């Protein structure tokens, strides 16, 4: 990756840039399908802020296959413990499936962090759970 170098500089303001950058790369380095996306919005009484997020299609293994589920989540600095913001990005030709793990707008339900928080689970472990669950239960199946 060539953007990795620029990625670190893209933040330079996180609580743990090092621990954040390493975690990010580790996720993409293991999946090879995900990629860190940049973003920025206003918050402090209306003031844009640098906030990185994850993007890309994650490999979802089926009974005997493996598709590429689209997802995107905001990577917080380190509060309360991990990024709670999690939603799926369905394409115009995709079809979102309602369930305990999905409402309808692609947003992920369930406490997740509020339930476990051992912590035990890390940045890589987080998506791992979604990958495990989404591995059997189709969150958003597209048309053939």
């Amino acid at each position: 990756a060539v953007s990795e170098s620029q990625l670190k500089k893209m933040v330079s303001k996180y609580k743990y840039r090092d621990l954040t950058v390493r975690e990010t790369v580790n996720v993409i380095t293991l999946y090879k399908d995900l990629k860190p996306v940049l973003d920025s919005y206003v918050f402090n009484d209306g003031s844009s802020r640098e906030l990185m997020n994850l993007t890309g299609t994650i490999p979802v293994p089926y009974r005997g296959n493996t598709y590429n589920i689209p997802i995107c989540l905001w990577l917080l600095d380190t509060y309360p413990y991990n990024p709670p913001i999690c939603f799926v990005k369905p394409t115009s030709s995709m079809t979102i499936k309602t369930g305990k793990h999905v409402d309808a707008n692609g947003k992920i339900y369930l406490p997740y962090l509020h339930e476990w928080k051992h912590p035990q689970s890390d940045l890589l472990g987080l998506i791992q759970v979604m990958i495990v669950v989404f591995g059997d239960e189709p969150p958003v199946f597209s048309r053939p």
Partner: peptide
């Protein structure tokens, strides 16, 4: 690769 997502019913 593309997204598309896994099939279903």
């Amino acid at each position: 690769p593309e997204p598309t997502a896994p099939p279903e019913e």
